[PDB]
Amino acid sequence: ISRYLTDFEPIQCLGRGGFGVVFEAKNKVDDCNYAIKRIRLPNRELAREKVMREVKALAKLEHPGIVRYFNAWLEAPPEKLQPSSPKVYLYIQMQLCRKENLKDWMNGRCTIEERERSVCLHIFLQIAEAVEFLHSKGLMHRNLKPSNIFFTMDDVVKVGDFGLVTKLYMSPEQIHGNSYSHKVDIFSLGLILFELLYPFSTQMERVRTLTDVRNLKFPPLFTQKYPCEYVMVQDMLSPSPMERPEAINIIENAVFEDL
Ligand SMILES: Cc1cc(NC(=O)[C@H](O)c2cc(F)cc(F)c2)ccc1-c1cnc(N)c(C(=O)NC2CC2)c1
Fold first, then answer.
1. CA 145 – CA 102 distance, rounded (Å)
2. Atom 25 of ligand 1, nearest CA residue
3. Is the CB of 144 under 6 A from ligand 1?
4. H helix runs in 80-182, sequence order
5. Where are the domains of the chain?
6. In what order do the strands lie in the sheet with 8-16?
């Protein structure tokens, strides 16, 4: 007797993000399509109050870098053997963004003349201003990767799924030594800003050149081409979080004086 099937008309599955299913589905009443994320909560009554704390905090979020929230409800569906094992589902209804994301955008633009310094920065600033907002509400994203950077049907850049918890964008302290600061986010931004400015022909050559930059090894053409941005991306990829800039400081940099 589940609220989803009765009140939403499925369209397609979009992925299984964080081992949780995400559906494009039309609300029968308002006749609008929505991205509907569904996870099973942990069974621990302790580690549920954890997840239920996050959703209450995320529902307060209002910013132009943050995918518009609509609703979040719970469903318990009541043969096999004699393990009952109770399974409660958390549904989160969000604004449906484009099926294609910043990696899709990047994949279809593998030449210098297709990566205008102007446009790349404009995409980065929208990400940074979202990460800043999150940090200011005492949250971190810890999930920044082109794969998970979306566009609204209106081409507003959005930071993708986060909260309710590839590693090429992850920070050293995030992968291992798992008591990290919010500055893990600044590491990810660092690689992303670089990647936007630096088009990649082939996936192997990307993974190589990102792994280089990740260890402060920068293609000599990139440094010469974009000198200010080089300076920034070094700081963002600083091995000590403390020496990495706060999103507010990145945003207020000269580089972003244009419209
Ligand atoms: C499902 C989904 C969740 C969020 N969640 C938050 O941002 C955050 O968890 C939050 C929760 C809250 F309750 C409130 C918030 F303000 C934020 C953001 C975006 C999408 C999404 C939207 N449209 C899409 N087309 C897709 C898509 O194509 N996904 C496939 C897997 C790759 C995903």
1. 8
2. 97
3. no
4. 102-107, 117-136, 172-175
5. 1-96, 97-259
6. 8-16, 21-27, 33-40, 89-95, 69-75
Pick the CATH number of 1-96 from 2.60.120.10, 3.40.250.10, 3.30.200.20, 3.40.640.10: 3.30.200.20
Distance 239 CA to ligand 1 centre (A): 30
Phi, psi of 196 (to 5 degrees): -50, -50
First-to-last alpha carbon distance for the chain, in angstroms, is 52
Tokens 């690689």 belong to which residue?
Answer: 191
Homologous superfamily of 97-259:
Transferase(Phosphotransferase) domain 1 (1.10.510.10)
d(CA 171, CA 238): 10
Neighbours of 106 (CB within 10 A): 22
Experimental method: X-ray
Name the resolution in angstroms.
Answer: 2.8
- The residue contributing the CA closest to ligand 1 atom 18 is 161
Would the CA dihedral through 116, 128, 212, 19 be positive or negative?
Answer: negative
Q: How far apart are CA 28 and CA 59, in angstroms?
A: 23
